[PDB]
Design a protein around this ligand. Structure first.
Ligand SMILES: O=c1[nH]cnc2c1ncn2[C@@H]1O[C@H](COP(=O)(O)O)[C@@H](O)[C@H]1O
Ligand SMILES: O=c1[nH]cnc2c1ncn2[C@@H]1O[C@H](COP(=O)(O)O)[C@@H](O)[C@H]1O
Ligand SMILES: *Cc1c(COP(=O)(O)O)cnc(C)c1O
Ligand SMILES: *Cc1c(COP(=O)(O)O)cnc(C)c1O
Ligand SMILES: Cn1c(=O)c2c(ncn2C)n(C)c1=O
Ligand SMILES: Cn1c(=O)c2c(ncn2C)n(C)c1=O
Lengths: 814, 814
């Protein structure tokens, strides 16, 4: 059937009876009223059974051996479905497929019933999920810590071409993977005031909110290691939240519990709301108590060995309060002197930066911290004081450098620069792509780099080959395994061996066959769940990621309209057929992004119903783009669009997902695109547009969009089409904000890359016309994507930051 | 060990491995970190396993055979713990006791970890729970329908002698007995308006709240019948509750979900709050859709057979909206003519009245119904119109009778008398005790009784012998079974056979021994969990029920202070030692009731620390009185206090609980007290005080408390002690509200029954001094309590109201 494992005689039989056990005893149903949803749950419970045994020994093991523990703090964990991924990592896929088949059920049909765990916005949240899988696979004693939102990223609905948001009640039917642990509930404090008495400060008169943990298992790839992802849920105490109308007192509990109610749906954007700050401290305060408790047990109160036993990784600045919180505990509660406490804190903390755009930077108003976390503000001022004293001593008289490096920003309202806080309290700061890391040193954190050059590093992102290959593209994984075996699943570098089959006639035919099968399946799914046909013979041109101005979905739109206009000019001229698919969610308050989604659908309305165009060009907007949808489109894509303005996309990861699944990449020299082209050879990549230096040259000069409008008739024609209502008949001025922006305030110079972009697009169309060569280029990309596995990234974090050695050693059976 | 069943070899072994299965796979724990709470859950899950098989066949059976279905609607279900009760009804107690013993655990210690299901206030909610158990035991296709409050009756804490309320988070650790059924979620409407179009009215523009069901199994006594208790939970739709700030929209969902958040803690008191009205319609609207769906399937759309297949019992007026709601559905949706719809509604509905005190009567302001349920108000006006037309036609010219019987009350604000609505739309109205039922006919509902005498009936309350005897008093159940067998557990009348052992020397010794063992165990529990000693040789004088003015805990207080004053007058005179225990919760807004609790504790402060008193008199306030606590005190009581003012306690059930457990009763000729004395012989009962007629004579005359104050020096002395601060030194005027009330506005004439009350108390003290005779009187009470089993009550409801025949037939195994 494939290498989804063995369908053993004894195990298929065992599986079937447990499936029936759960359907009866757990679901309390009888075959005669059981629905597909019930069947999915019976299976989910049966599969979950297989890793509890391993889960218990893994955790017990870490308690015995007592290795250094890695704590990955993140406010987001974009997990997606977990049934199939668990079967894969446990080598249960074929056995379950068989058993369910014998029970007369279609496993694939049941897998589709599982709700996605959308506790993330995009890249940042998904990185965390891939990292967890890799840390488990590399046998690291790692813990994922976050918030258990009852509402994840909203579900996107398109109504009249506009995005409509609706609550993601992912817990509605229950979550068979999590295990509530009410017995480990912890208290978290808010507000109050600070008392300075005799021997130390005291945080007093605080409001208490309880943090209840929920553990979810994270199985490594076939090594019997099952790590833990602990997610905190807010609960109100039953005393003061009643003890300070009786009915009203009880109804008001849903005020303390609102803290873990919903994920903020902003991607690369900072909103200084108090509820967000509360979520950030909540996850930090609860998590740290757990970290210290575990340490106090260990084999040990000298906190001198704390950094030898603990490592906490900050996924962006969101969990940055962990620095002043670790100090508070050590100094206020444990009574360590400042200097000793600081040494410990810096040595256990490490920070990961994800972007350089200003609007994404967390700068919290002081009055907010002042009211909500009074003691933390005091600690931050003191950290700032001592840090600046270090700067002055290093750069005597550099008074401007002092104000520039301050953790405290003066002005309208004083704010705290969380990024500066993280650099100061961490022993390592890293970028997520080579170019992004360099930019950090040359620009944004230049002053900090000059002060402590040893702190700055790079750790190029990666994706897990398990979910992003074996799981979503079994067909491709099979033919690869037929030639080079299976060891590449946990050693992606081995994909290089595929280079020697680049001229192999059978392989070329096979690689091309699986991609064709994937396109047919997706084209079907399209009509199944969304309804309105596409042509599987055309080039699948797809751009899927969050809707942003910097990601330039607009630049993609300009190209689409150009293709359309050229066809209408010479209708009877042959052009390579294309189905361009654009998908992604816009943050609710991002007006421009929502305007762009309307533009996309507007273009599709015109293009898809023009008889002269026929099946040569289709514009489709992929609704509710999420992890589970990504697992479907990516394996079916031919062309991957990664066209952000050079210098704006820190790294990106979707690009990597496409490269590993047989799609060619048209993109700019941005983020990881650079290392990908470098790995496959620029000749097997479609690079275009300005490089970072060109962007800066243009900025010195000054960007004037009119110029491009004046010199390019094709561009001019498009803008006048938008301006006159060609794409919005009933509301002619509908897109005035887009045009206005493009012409007068384009921060991402869309027009500057237009000419080179369509020119480059012509080159891919030329290559698509030559199936054999297109496929050979594909093989060159796949065979060379090994570097982008999160196992490599994690192995680097482990050795260069955490001080731990990865291990591919199978844990002593289950 | 006892007749808790057989401890079979194969079954104890089977139990142990499943206990271990759940501890590992369900709880995900290992013996080395498992706590008693974990062990309780492993056992609970193991026991729950045994009734799912029976639960599924029972429900499947009803679907095949299709018998008349009984729907018991109640806003309260005071269930208490359910582990032991399930073992008992399944004959698993000894096997589980053995198995757990072999696993090295104490079953009793684990049973104490289970949280009470306190979804009730007192009598009304407990009646519903006892009824469910009896209906299951008598093999009726019955369903309990209510609301799944996440916060039940508050937990009472005494701070400085005052009651402190605190949220009852009974779901904190989970509920292993319930089964969420999200797939059967139903929509419920609120607000909106009414459109009258061509062919009928339409309820439009309504706000939708979803009702999610949770099923809990109700096992019959050893007959393999497991009925269902369906509890609705409020959930917000994910569309409009977002689709009409994005964050705020999501946080505001906890507005529609507040409907099932908390139980109103009022006992026999009406509060016209909108949230209450919402809870009442919510349970009614959701439940009826389920009833009709089930009917539409049946073996059948002629609703003529609806009453032959359905019976809905209204537990008080709380679910009264079921009448106009059934009409709305039949007329508005099914399109039946009014008259046909009304005939059907009246024939399937039946109403149970629980009290005659005005302050407990539900009279909803019209403006509230007008805004929240516009169509229901219209239907109620139309029902009223046609009903009054019936009255006028029966009593021509009786214009006053017309206004008196109206469902609509004029005045300050127009209101709807829910009780009148229930009488009009039901084919049977019943009281809960013979005297209460007569009073209804002679007083409160006299006009209605004259109009349709056939509607009025009586159904004397009862209690379940399983939980209220076998479960809480295994020692007594054992010695009874030793002489007459076990058939009495489901045939309590057989207790009469115990009359022939009334002179048996061994039995007298045994009955007295178990009571002594029960007192020792309770006296221990007291020091264990609450701490401060009592003497197990004294008379256990206990009054446990909700704190009320009509229940006269105050009359009990007067007696306690009298005993104290007599001892202080003649210290060296012998008096029978007593431990008087008073317990019960006061509704949060009931000032007087909270004042009474403070008085009780105040008396105990003086009495319990007076050296001259010694161990001859102890005053104890039983904290957090609830079902699980009742199962502890009652079996240990010698004297049961049921001293309400004649005519105010509809029936009472605690009185019955005490009679069955070997306690003697000192009470007034009120509620069921009358039938109890009638059953045991007034010579074996301590009756005192005014009878109903005496109370009325006094009212004609006019009640003047001064008189009693003037003629009784002992009474006078007590009042002056309260007035001068003898019981409240630091705050001398603390009890001025109690004294003021007692002297000027005592609606329950406490002083009128004082003299006869202490005189009667002297008689019980005299009898207690004669152990042999006290015990013989006890045997006369127990042997004669058979009539008060809920099996008798249910059998009567079944035959005289529902039209179904009970059956003690074992369902075809599990
Ligand atoms: O005091 C202890 N005795 C024995 N095992 C322990 C003890 N504390 C932790 N463990 C084991 O270590 C695992 C780790 O628990 P943690 O504290 O959540 O990391 C537990 O599930 C147990 O198997
Ligand atoms: O359409 C049907 N086919 C077969 N069994 C049914 C069907 N509807 C109900 N049942 C059975 O009847 C039980 C009663 O379900 P209820 O609708 O919740 O009362 C179900 O659990 C099934 O065993
Ligand atoms: C991988 C992934 C992302 C990140 O994509 P980029 O193109 O790097 O912005 C976002 N969303 C989902 C659902 C993903 O799978
Ligand atoms: C039986 C019971 C009641 C009813 O007692 P009465 O004396 O009839 O008022 C109230 N509360 C609980 C906990 C009960 O067990
Ligand atoms: C101006 N703006 C927003 O207003 C915004 C956003 N992301 C979310 N929002 C609300 N981004 C990226 C942005 O540039
Ligand atoms: C006056 N009053 C109340 O105010 C009250 C009550 N029960 C609850 N409350 C709040 N009762 C029985 C009562 O008589």
């Amino acid at each position: 059937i494939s290498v989804r494992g063995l369908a053993g005689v004894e195990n298929v039989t065992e599986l079937k009876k447990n499936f029936n056990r759960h359907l009866h005893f757990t679901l309390v149903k009888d075959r005669n009223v059981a629905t597909p949803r019930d069947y999915y749950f019976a299976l989910a419970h049966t599969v979950r059974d297989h890793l509890v045994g391993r889960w218990i020994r893994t955790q017990q093991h870490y308690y015995e051996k007592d290795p250094k523990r890695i704590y990955y703090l993140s406010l987001e964990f974009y997990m997606g479905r977990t049934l199939q991924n668990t079967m894969v990592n446990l080598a249960l896929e074929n056995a379950c497929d068989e058993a369910t088949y014998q029970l007369g059920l279609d496993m694939e049909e049941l897998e589709e019933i599982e709700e996605d765990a959308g506790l993330g916005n995009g890249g940042l949240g998904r990185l965390a999920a891939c990292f967890l899988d890799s840390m488990a696979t590399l046998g690291l004693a790692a813990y994922g810590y976050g918030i258990r939102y009852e509402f994840g990223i909203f579900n996107q609905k398109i109504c009249g071409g506009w995005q409509m948001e609706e609550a993601d009640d992912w817990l509605r039917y229950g979550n068979p993977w999590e295990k509530a642990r009410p017995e480990f509930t912890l208290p978290v404090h808010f507000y109050g005031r600070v008392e300075h008495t005799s021997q130390g400060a005291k945080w007093v008169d605080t409001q208490v909110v309880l943090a209840m943990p929920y553990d979810t298992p994270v199985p490594g790839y076939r090594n019997n290691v099952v790590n833990t992802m602990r997610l905190w849920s807010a609960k109100a105490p039953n005393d003061f939240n009643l003890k300070d109308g009786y009915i009203q007192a009880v109804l008001d509990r849903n005020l303390a519990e609102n803290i873990s109610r919903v994920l903020y749906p902003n991607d690369n954007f900072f909103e200084g709301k108090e509820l967000r700050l509360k979520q950030e401290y909540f996850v930090v305060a609860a998590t740290l108590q757990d970290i210290i408790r575990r340490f106090k047990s260990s084999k040990f109160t000298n906190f001198d060995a704390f950094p030898d036993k603990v490592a906490i990784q900050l996924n962006d600045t969101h969990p940055s309060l962990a620095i002043p919180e670790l100090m508070r505990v050590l100094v206020d509660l444990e009574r360590l002197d400042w200097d000793k406490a600081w040494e410990v804190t810096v040595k256990t903390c490490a920070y990961t930066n994800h972007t350089v755009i200003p609007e994404a930077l967390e700068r919290w108003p002081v009055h907010l911290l002042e009211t909500l976390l009074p003691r933390h503000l005091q600690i931050i001022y003191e950290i700032n004081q001592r840090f600046l004293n270090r700067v002055a001593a290093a750069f005597p008289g550099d008074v401007d450098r002092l104000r520039r490096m301050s953790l405290v920003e003066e002005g309208a309202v004083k704010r705290i620069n969380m990024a500066h806080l993280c650099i100061a309290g961490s022993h390592a700061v890293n970028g997520v792509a080579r170019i992004h890391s360099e930019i950090l040193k040359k620009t944004i954190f230049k002053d900090f780099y000059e002060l402590e050059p040893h702190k700055f590093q790079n750790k190029t992102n990666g994706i897990t080959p398990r979910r992003w290959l074996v799981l979503c593209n079994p067909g491709l994984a099979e033919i690869i395994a037929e030639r080079i075996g299976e060891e590449y699943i946990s050693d992606l570098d081995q994909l290089r061996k595929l280079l020697s089959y680049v001229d192999d006639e059978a392989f070329i035919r096979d690689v091309a066959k699986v991609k064709q099968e994937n396109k047919l399946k997706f084209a079907a799914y399209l009509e199944r769940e969304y309804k309105v046909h596409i042509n599987p013979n055309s080039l699948f041109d797809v751009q899927v990621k969050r809707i942003h101005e910097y990601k330039r979905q607009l630049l993609n739109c300009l190209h689409v309209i150009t293709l359309y206009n050229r066809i209408k000019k010479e209708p009877n001229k042959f052009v390579v057929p294309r189905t361009v698919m654009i998908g992604g969610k816009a943050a609710p308050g991002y007006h421009m992004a929502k305007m762009i989604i309307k533009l996309i659908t507007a273009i599709g309305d015109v293009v898809n119903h023009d008889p002269v165009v026929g099946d040569r060009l289709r514009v489709i907007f992929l609704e509710n783009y999420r992890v589970s949808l990504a697992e479907k489109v990516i394996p079916a894509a031919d062309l991957s669009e990664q066209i952000s303005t050079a210098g704006t996309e820190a790294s990106g990861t979707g690009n990597m997902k496409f490269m590993l699944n047989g799609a060619l990449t048209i993109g700019t020299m941005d983020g990881a695109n650079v290392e990908m082209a470098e790995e496959a050879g620029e000749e097997n990549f479609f690079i275009f547009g300005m490089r970072v230096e060109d962007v800066d040259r243009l900025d010195q000069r000054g960007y004037n969009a009119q110029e491009y409008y004046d010199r390019i008739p094709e561009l001019r024609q498009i803008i006048e089409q938008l301006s006159s209502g060609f794409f919005s008949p009933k509301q002619p001025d509908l897109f005035k904000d887009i045009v206005n922006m493009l012409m007068h305030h384009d921060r991402f110079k869309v027009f500057a890359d237009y000419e080179e972009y369509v020119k480059c697009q012509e080159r891919v169309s030329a290559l698509y016309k030559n199936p054999r060569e297109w496929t050979r280029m594909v093989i060159r990309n796949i065979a060379t994507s090994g570097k982008f596995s999160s196992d490599r990234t994690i192995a680097q974090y482990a050795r260069e930051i955490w001080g731990v050695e990865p291990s591919r050693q199978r844990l002593p059976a289950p």
